[PDB]
Design a protein around this ligand. Structure first.
Ligand SMILES: *[C@@H]1O[C@H](CO[C@@H]2O[C@@H](C)[C@@H](O)[C@@H](O)[C@@H]2O)[C@@H](O[C@@H]2O[C@H](CO)[C@@H](O)[C@H](O)[C@H]2NC(C)=O)[C@H](O)[C@H]1NC(C)=O
Ligand SMILES: *[C@@H]1O[C@H](CO[C@@H]2O[C@@H](C)[C@@H](O)[C@@H](O)[C@@H]2O)[C@@H](O[C@@H]2O[C@H](CO)[C@@H](O)[C@H](O)[C@H]2NC(C)=O)[C@H](O)[C@H]1NC(C)=O
Ligand SMILES: *[C@@H]1O[C@H](CO[C@@H]2O[C@@H](C)[C@@H](O)[C@@H](O)[C@@H]2O)[C@@H](O[C@@H]2O[C@H](CO)[C@@H](O)[C@H](O)[C@H]2NC(C)=O)[C@H](O)[C@H]1NC(C)=O
Ligand code: CL
Ligand code: CL
Ligand code: CL
Lengths: 240, 240, 240
């Protein structure tokens, strides 16, 4: 298990989709400040902090912009915990194939396309999951189809890898994306995979999601992932 | 036939997509107030009302927000009739597979996905219409594929049913959505089907549309439709 | 070859996607005014013009709105050349299947659908490229499938043709769209095809793009293209 409050480091068991409540009771009644008052009575946050969560705007897109701005795990986690306690169905919706919290990433995944799916479209991910949206298959042949192709053409690994990141930040802004970026900067891509696997376990029915995630697990295994270097705005998303 | 002006109740023959003009002449010249002046000279509305349609903003998204706000059939129908007389190609575009009035719902249908299509993707709706966008088939097997699956898992009926509503309001905001919601609150889902069928008859070529509509006709037949209860904002969309 | 600066007429070798740099060095450092200062030192533009490119707003959507507003080839080309020198990866992204400069047209192509794909979906474009997104095929059967269908129903040529234009302007706003519109007004559609072919040559890997472009090359061959007449806003996009 994990104590996300005592931890001064981000650990994968503490990223947003793993720490959200599983379900909710009355979302319309709660506000950020009320749920923060509750964390204070729990002795998780101070009364000072709870009165300081007005830093999240009234709107949801704003709250997320603030959360993304944070430069420490303590602050980012506190804001995420208030946020997801007010929107308690936020990651609950990822249990299904639609939802408001999914709009950004589904749109992105169905619009921005990978280069590998263009180069050879025979692989079941491209021709079955991304197109047909089925994704009920547990069996993808990733290696047979894509290994030599990424081996040869490195800039299409660069493109597909950065695309995978853009999508991941649209799905899970905050701690989860920061954890992933961080394992990449350190030149240890595969240590993100553990988190990804735990994410898969939470949303068994989101078939598009599971497919995309398995593809990312794949890209992270490629040697080319350890040679990838981050653009300046990605580096900015990290911690001080 | 129907007299939509004498009616003090919403009837299905009077919902927006059925009452729009079939085609247009010069749309650029007309404004809301001009077409309202014409309804007044027709003795359908009073000169007072015609001078009161500035309540629709200059923009189209605003006019629709106002129309949706109305709490009576008389007012909602009056505003819809002015609106669709200014945008006289509005539902004309639904005769085809593209158009400005379609942007919201097509985007939604291709982005937000149903849970049934994830659970078993073999059914021709999922694997042929939603993915491949063909939908030229008249034959869907809905019962063989989906009956036992919705029977067992009720929360995926809940999700897919609310999704179907979100899409319907994106396609046909106003009277048509209010008529549908109302038949649902009354615990008589299948009485909406008649309207849906008339809608199908108007846009034979919009194959995505016809497919989605047939799916909704299906969901409305399930016992689970009569047990569905509406979230507060849906109830707000109804009439006083 | 072509001298795009001495030319007082728009030629196809001078449209935006053909004249963009192929790649970039440091995009974050440059602004419109800096790259315009560089064109001035090159003796391509006057110092007056370079100090006049503040007419492009700070944002990118605004710069594009201004570029589209221009009523001459000299001005439109000057603004495009500054613009694409600041965003030097703009059409570089079209070498791949994702990117910021692609968001508008991919969204449009996957959301707004053609009438032909609804009428008979057997043709490989509809059932393979638009749906499945593969598009690795060089072989489309366009004639066998679509010739008699557009022959008979003229309003679906009208719809699919205007759709093709809406998409083209989302992909290549500015000179390329103006060149295309112009060849259409003059009742010489097929003279746009040359440009389209050169565009195909620049982005071999963008399979969706190549497919859509081949479809437009097809529509431009149909007699019905020479009978098409432009709506007023299309005519407004042209030159004085
Ligand atoms: C497909 O590729 C993976 C990993 O990619 C390779 O990694 C390097 C060893 C190098 O060969 C690169 O060009 C490739 O991109 C292979 O799996 C890894 O193999 C290494 C070999 O030492 C092993 O140590 C790792 O544990 C393996 N797994 C990883 C990195 O996740 C894999 O074998 C290739 N072939 C098939 C059929 O999958
Ligand atoms: C598939 O389901 C429909 C309706 O769903 C069922 O309705 C209840 C009777 C109950 O069995 C629920 O668990 C199901 O969800 C079936 O069609 C209806 O059957 C009833 C039986 O009394 C009949 O009165 C209705 O008129 C039928 N039609 C409707 C409601 O539109 C249908 O038979 C099932 N099987 C197949 C193969 O379609
Ligand atoms: C499919 O159609 C193209 C062009 O469309 C036809 O053009 C007219 C001649 C008329 O028949 C319209 O109803 C059609 O829409 C055919 O190709 C053209 O044929 C003309 C004949 O004179 C020739 O001059 C052009 O060069 C041809 N190519 C063009 C216009 O790009 C084509 O033959 C038709 N059939 C097949 C199998 O492709
Ligand atoms: Cl979050
Ligand atoms: Cl309406
Ligand atoms: Cl441009």
């Amino acid at each position: 298990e994990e104590d996300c409050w005592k931890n001064e480091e981000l650990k994968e068991d503490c990223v947003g989709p793993l720490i959200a409540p599983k379900d909710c009771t009355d979302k319309d009644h709660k506000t950020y400040l009320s749920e923060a008052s509750l964390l204070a009575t729990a002795k998780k946050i101070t009364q000072v902090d709870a009165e300081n969560v007005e830093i999240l705007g009234k709107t949801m897109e704003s709250a997320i912009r603030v959360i993304e701005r944070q430069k420490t795990y303590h602050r980012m986690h506190l804001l995420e915990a208030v946020f997801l306690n007010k929107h308690c169905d936020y990651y609950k919706m990822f249990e299904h194939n639609s939802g408001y919290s999914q709009v950004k990433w589904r749109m992105m995944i169905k619009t921005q396309h990978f280069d590998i799916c263009a180069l050879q479209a025979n692989s079941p991910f491209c021709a079955q999951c991304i197109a047909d949206n089925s994704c009920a298959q547990g069996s993808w042949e990733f290696d047979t189809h894509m290994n030599s192709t990424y081996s040869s053409k490195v800039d299409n690994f660069k493109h597909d890898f950065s695309l995978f990141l853009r999508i991941f930040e649209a799905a899970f802004p905050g701690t989860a994306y920061v954890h992933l970026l961080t394992n990449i900067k350190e030149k240890k891509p595969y240590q993100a995979v553990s988190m990804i696997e735990k994410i898969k376990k939470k949303f068994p029915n989101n078939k598009l999601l599971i497919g995309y995630l398995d593809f990312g697990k794949y890209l992270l295994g490629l040697s080319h992932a350890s040679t990838y270097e981050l653009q300046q705005r990605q580096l900015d998303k990290l911690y001080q």
